[PDB]
Every structure is written in C-alpha cells, then in structure tokens.
Paper text:
We developed a rapid procedure for accurately modeling large numbers of peptides bound to the common class I MHC protein HLA-A*0201 (HLA-A2), which was applied to a curated dataset incorporating thousands of immunogenic, non-immunogenic, and non-HLA-A2 binding peptides. Yet for a peptide bound to an MHC protein, the impact of features such as exposed hydrophobic surface and charges are determined by the peptide's conformation within the binding groove, as well as the size and position of the various amino acid side chains. As has been noted previously, nonameric peptides bound to class I MHC proteins adopt relatively conserved backbone conformations. Our hypothesis was predicated on the notion that immunogenicity is influenced by both peptide binding to the MHC protein as well as TCR binding to the peptide/MHC complex.
As we intended to emphasize structural differences emerging from amino acid mutations, we further narrowed our database by pairing each peptide/HLA-A2 complex with at least one other in which the peptide differed by only a single amino acid, either as a substitution or transposition. However, in the more common instances in which mutations occur outside of anchor residues and do not strongly impact peptide-MHC binding, T cells that efficiently recognize the wild-type peptide will have been deleted or otherwise tolerized. In these instances, an immunogenic neoantigen must possess structural and physical properties distinct enough to promote efficient recognition by T cells that ignore the wild-type peptide (i.e., the single mutation must result in a peptide that is “sufficiently different” from its wild-type counterpart to overcome self-tolerance). Deployed against a set of HLA-A2-presented nonameric neoantigens, the network not only permitted predictions of immunogenicity, but yielded testable hypotheses about how the mutations influenced immunogenicity. The utility of these models is found when comparing results for mutant peptides and their wild-type counterparts, as the models can indicate the types of structural alterations that impact TCR recognition of a mutated vs. wild-type peptide/MHC complex.
Author numbering:
A (entry chain B): 1 to 100
B (entry chain A): 1 to 275
C (entry chain C): 1 to 9
Write the structure that this text describes.
Amino acid sequence: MIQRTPKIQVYSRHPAENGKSNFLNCYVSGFHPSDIEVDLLKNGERIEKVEHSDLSFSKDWSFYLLYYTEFTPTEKDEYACRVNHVTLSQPKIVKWDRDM
Amino acid sequence: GSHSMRYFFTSVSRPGRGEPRFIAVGYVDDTQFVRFDSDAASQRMEPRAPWIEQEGPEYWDGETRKVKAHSQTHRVDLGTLRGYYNQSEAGSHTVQRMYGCDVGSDWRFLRGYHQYAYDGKDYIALKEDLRSWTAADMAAQTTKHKWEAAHVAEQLRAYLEGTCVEWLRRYLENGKETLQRTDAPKTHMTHHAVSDHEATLRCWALSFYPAEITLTWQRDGEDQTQDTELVETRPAGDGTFQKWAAVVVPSGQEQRYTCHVQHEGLPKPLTLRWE
Amino acid sequence: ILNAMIAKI
C-alpha cells in the first residue's frame, strides 16, 4: 500500500535567545500511513512533557503533525528530533540549528 | 479577501486493538477551531480557537452528536471497504474524508468540496458541479451507484451551498479579530561562511498569517529557482507561520542577490538585499 | 458546523 516518508523540520517558535523562554518545534509532514513516533531530545535524552497538534492532512492526503515543548535555549544545550515511521529502516535524527 | 471552511476526518482500523481511531478537525482558512478524538476522555467535540468558545451548549451538544454520527459511519466504512478489496482482518487500513466550501471576496459561495480516500488514494469525490461523482476504480463505482440512488449529492449540495457558507460567515464575523486578520511577515537575513570562497544567504519570513506566501531569490534580477533551497511553510505553534529560502553565493557576489517576499499582509512586495 | 447527513460507502 501507499507509503510516504515524513519530512522533518526542527526549530523554535521564536528566534532563539539564550536564557529566554521559547518553544521547541518538530514538524513532521508528507507521511503516510498515520502511525508515527516523534520524540524531542535534550542532549540525547528524551523530553517527557511533549504535546502535539491534532492529526490533519494536506490536499494530497499525506499527514502532518506539530510536536512541541517549552524550553529555554542555552549556549551549550543541544536539541534534536527523533522520528520513526514505517518508511524509515532506523530512527531519523535531525539536530536543531537555531538559524534553520 | 477569500475564505474557506474545511473539515478533515481520519479513521484508522486497529486489528485486535479494539475500536478504530477516529480524528475530526475543523478549519477556517488556516486556523483550526474544533476537534474530536476517539481516544480522548471527553468524547465531545472540543474548541480549539478562543472565538468558538462563546458558542453555547446547543452548539457543542449538536456538534458532538453529529461528529459521533461521522465516527459511526467511518467505523462501518472500514469493514465495508475491507470487503470491497478482499483484504484480511489482520492489517490496518486508513480512510480519510474532507469537505467544505470556498467563498470569494464578496463572501458568496464560490466552490464546494467532498473528497474521500482509502489507504492514501482517491476513492470517490463530488465533482465541481456538486451533482456527479468521480469514482477511481471498480469498487468506488459501487459506492457511486449507491449514492446516486440515494441522492447523496443533492443533500451535500444543499449543505455546501447553504449551511456551509452561512456558518462560515458567522465564524468570520464572530472570530473577526482572529480570522479577518493578516500578520505581515517579519523578515531578516543571515549570512554564514560555509568555506573561504562561498557563503549561505538565508532569507527568513516569520510570524505571518495566513500561510500563503512567496519567497524567492534573484541574481541580477534573474530567478534562481533551480538554485534556491526552499523549506515547506511551517507552523510556529502560536497560530502564525514561518518559511525561509537560502542560496549559496560566491564570496564577493552578495550584492548581486535579492530576496523577494510576497504576502497578503504586506502593503507592497519586499525586496531585500545583503548589504 | 458539520453536515448532519453522512452516507456510508
């Protein structure tokens, strides 16, 4: 059956400023079927309190979801998004870049 | 400007794991305002925008009742579609449904939609005239004949041209501050030395609504479409959107490159240049 | 608001 790979973007809601409260976003879109596992990572460890938007889909029927959590960026803390899906043989990890 | 209202329904069978999943969401333009989740505790249609919260108990009780009637139909549809295609009970399958209406700048009916998909492919859809059906394969034609005999398109057309646009207008007036707004993009550039003889120029657009936007780069006025990295427009999570476009420029050529921003919230298109 | 009639496939 139809299987489409998720596109992954990891980014902050506001421009990253060290010491200022923000939201870390991981946006997964373009995927099919709907089962997908998304985790936000702080220095390689899974963040517990992560929320996500309500499952919706684009005109071509592929799904999109926004996972997000409050965070205060620092100079040294590294963040990333870890996504697993039927189209991925192993989890795909995208590192957060504050000018991407 | 023009406006739309859309409802999206997802139904996923869960063999051995009980009832199928069912998620419904409603949108006005790019703003979600209602949702229903079969796995959530409330078993109600729930508000997702502040301007829909003033709707009283009758609205919520009626939308809850109707959304349950959508859920029950999709629960049956999964079994029915499984039979049409001679599929086993062991596999999970997906049904999606979308319908809604478009209004133009005069806020009168412009277009109506009702689309249905099985396992990621078009299954059956109402044609633009809101009177005939487009059926993808042989199985879909059995549904088409059933819906033609039951005059399903006649009732859908009345909903799409009547109820749908009337309540769209009501939502637009009630949520005027949220739905009749435009947030212009806040724009800036970044410059990152990749190596010693080329650098990445990235044109940002932030905090804009609605999602529609055009971000392009030019070199000496010539479009750089094949040489521009363009990310998909993405939600900020606060109801606005983000997008950037980047180009790799040889060092000393930054002055040749212009970034162009077209968005409804701008008084006129932007031309940006690293200088 | 939702449509009140939902025909099964």
